[PDB]
Enzyme design. Structure first.
Site: not given
Ligand SMILES: [Zn+2]
Ligand SMILES: [Zn+2]
Ligand SMILES: [Zn+2]
Lengths: 106, 150
Positions: B77, B84-86
């Protein structure tokens, strides 16, 4: 846009606005049971979505019930003058009136 | 000079800091924060000290806080740039969430990667097929980049 003031005793978290973290100003409640300042949930609905910020549940502006119990008891709380320097304390309901007579001000 | 919401929220973090996370405002610009998250236990990042930079846009809390890893890290992620891929930082954000909410999310993401929400291409899938391999690589990167507490 809630009441930016020191509440002593400190403000209870149930009366804190999730959106501005101040005491609820013109308390309103959502169908889903959350409270905000009347002006904050409108601001969130108008440009954040027609969902309750607390749980993303559909909200809609015509579903904000006045939380008259909360408005009543928040205004009866003891607070301190937020004019920095002043050392006056009174029922929040009267803060405003006191303003017209503060040594520190406009 | 900085909004009350940010001012008040800051005091609460410094007051009741999140376990395993250390975060303070920029001594030069409160909209910026210097975060250090200790690698979760039993996780591939066990025993590492990660640095992240969190910045609060002007539209905050209506717009989400931008966060990025400064310490290299092998995780599905996070990309090479440290982004950050959130979910909660993209579309699933709400003016009701807080900085503490983001700090806690990122940390849980270390204790247990979410290979799709969406995901940083590469690692994302490698963690799917050769999960054993992906994990050793992450442990390796943790020893290589997050054990000299720069
Ligand atoms: Zn709700
Ligand atoms: Zn409010
Ligand atoms: Zn006064």
């Amino acid at each position: 846009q809630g009441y930016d003031v020191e509440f002593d005793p400190p403000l209870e978290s149930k009366y804190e606005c999730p959106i501005c973290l101040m005491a609820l100003r013109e308390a309103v409640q959502t169908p889903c049971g959350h409270r905000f300042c009347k002006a904050c949930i409108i601001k969130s609905i108008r440009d954040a979505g027609h969902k309750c910020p607390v749980d993303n549940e559909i909200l809609l502006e015509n579903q904000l019930f006045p939380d008259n119990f909360a408005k009543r008891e928040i205004l009866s709380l003891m607070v301190k003058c937020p004019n920095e320097g002043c050392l006056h304390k009174m029922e929040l309901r009267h803060l405003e009136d006191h303003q017209a007579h503060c040594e520190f001000a406009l | 000079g900085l909004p009350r919401r940010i001012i008040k929220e800051t005091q609460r973090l410094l007051a009741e800091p999140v376990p395993g996370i250390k975060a303070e405002p920029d001594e030069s610009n409160a909209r910026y924060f210097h975060v250090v998250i200790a690698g979760p236990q039993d996780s591939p990042f066990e025993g590492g000290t990660f640095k992240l930079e969190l910045f609060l846009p002007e539209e905050y809390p209506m717009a989400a806080p931008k966060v990025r890893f400064m310490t290299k890290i092998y995780h599905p992620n996070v990309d090479k740039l440290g982004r950050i891929c959130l979910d909660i930082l993209k579309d699933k954000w709400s003016p009701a969430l807080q900085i503490r909410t983001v700090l806690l999310s990122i940390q849980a993401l270390l204790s247990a990667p979410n290979p799709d929400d969406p995901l940083a291409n590469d690692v994302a899938e490698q963690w799917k097929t050769n999960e054993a391999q992906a994990i050793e690589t992450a442990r390796a990167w943790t020893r290589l980049y997050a054990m000299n507490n720069i």
